[PDB]
Amino acid sequence: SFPHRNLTWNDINFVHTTDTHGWYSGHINQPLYHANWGDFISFTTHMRRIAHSRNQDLLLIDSGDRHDGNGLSDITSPNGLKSTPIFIKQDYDLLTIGNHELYLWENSKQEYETVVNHFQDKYVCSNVDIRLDNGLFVPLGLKYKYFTTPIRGIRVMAFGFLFDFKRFNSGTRVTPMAETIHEPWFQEALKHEVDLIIIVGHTPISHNWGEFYQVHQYLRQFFPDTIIQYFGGHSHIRDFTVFDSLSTGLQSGRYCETVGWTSVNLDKADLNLPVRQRFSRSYIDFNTDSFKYHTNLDKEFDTAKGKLVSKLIRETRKELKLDTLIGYVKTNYYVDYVPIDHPKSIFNLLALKILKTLPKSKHEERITIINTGSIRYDLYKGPYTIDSKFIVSPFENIWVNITVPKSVATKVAAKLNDYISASRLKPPHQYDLQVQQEKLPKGYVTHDDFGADGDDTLHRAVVNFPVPNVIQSVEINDEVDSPVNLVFYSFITPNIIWALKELNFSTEQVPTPYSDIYLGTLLNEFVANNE
Ligand code: NA
Ligand SMILES: [Zn+2]
Secondary structure (H helix, E strand, O other), X not given: OOOEOOOOOOOEEXXXXXXXXXXXXXXXXXXXXXXXXXXHHHHXXXXXXXXXXXXXXXXXXXXXXXXXXXXXXXXXXXXXXXXXXXXXXXXXXXXXXXXXXXOXXXXXXXXXXXXXXXXXXXXXXXXXXXXXXXXXXXXXXXXXXXXXXXXXXXXXXXXXXXOOOOOOOOOEEEOOHHHHOOOHHHHHHOOOOOOEEEEEOOOOOOOOOOHHHHHHHHHHHHOOOOEEEEEEOOOOOEEEEEEEOOEEEXXXXXXXXXXXEEEEOOOOHHXXXXXXHHEEEEEEEOOHHHHHHHHOOOOOOOXXXXXXXXXXXXXXXXXXXXXXXXXXXXXXXXXXXOOOOOOOEHHHHHXXXXXXXXXXXXXXXXXXXXXXXHOOOXXXXXXXXXXXXXXXXXXXXXXXXXXXXXXXXXXXXXXXXXXXXXXXXXXXXXXXXXXXXXXXXXXXXXXXXXXXXXXXXXXXXXXXXXXXXXXXXXXXXXXXXXXXXXXXXXXXXXXXXXXXXXXXXXXXXXXXXXXXXXXXXXXXXXXXXXX
């Protein structure tokens, strides 16, 4: 029930999602994001119908990462078995892959067989290949799409680019977009005549990231006065970036908190329009107040399709037992509203109380290290459910260890916290922390290339502290040099090995299994107060 900023519509309109991470049920602990996928389906039904009645085109676009962060997607093996049927009920026009569809073979195979198969001609991946059962590799989806819009006959070419991701499973291949552009097939794709180029990508649109920029230079050589619109993701932020007067990028947040909006005027390049006149953007809070406002409906908002999807969500959550209560949390614990050494930090809670509950021998000295990016959400006070485990700690990381002297072990976390890591260890939004009344709800106030007013709702701006790459839980008996078990996630092995080399510690000791108990299980037992 808030005052809203108006959307600017235009020739072609874009509705954008990214980094949904299975949040199709809506948010219970942040009611500004209460709406579910059904409501969003009602929303876009009307917004398409509205656009068509105004002789305008509208396209829905998704930039990937559709699991790892929610019970709806994560409770099943493989991930997404019950959330995908919900996701694909939305009528996307273009979509691409994120890195979370690529960590495990089961996920990549699932993606190819369900999502790509469903959105056969709409799923575009230019730089990711998948292994067929016969051992040969094929593009995971289309390498590009050439099409014309149904209302205004706009001739558009679309490409799809994943960021330079290193940890893909070996049943897939990612090629950096900087190399993809010099490949034979790409030059052949550039021979088309187009009114509009769409670059969808699970890639941050930030100029500090810099991958889309290199693609932009190359495309400007061949298409010097074509409108090129980018849709990015990965880094979990609302963002909008100007490449030039004929080119911008939109990024639409995370966790179904945000529906991104962009409209473009497609009058000729000769007219020399100001970029702010040609393009407009908005970030829409994922709630029905925002959805009802922008469609101008209330009583007539709910569609029969939307209502069916919302019912399917409730039926799915019930059957997965997601709202089954495990316990109660006494106080709020935050990812980054306080720093990691503050008592209301979820990282302090982990370092002081939870990580210590990993089983230990009587005389054992250990230091346990985790990356901050393994925690995906705040731990809110009140009821803690089955779903809460996956929302906070979705990853099925087991624990390995190496035994090293205390003199070395005590230096490792500081070494890792110093350092450009091959893969990002922090929560995704923690790399854009450059910065520039009581009635308003708490939410985002985005500062992008078009200024500070893109958010569809006036908010009291939320603030984050920087967090380190890793935190440690130290369990030693004294300050005396002794053997210490350095305990960590199997996947941060390369980082530990790097740190040990930087501390000039040589060993050909390899990490050995330490514990199969997931962090999420330790969290459950801590909350329940028994085990
Ligand atoms: Na910003
Ligand atoms: Zn991602």
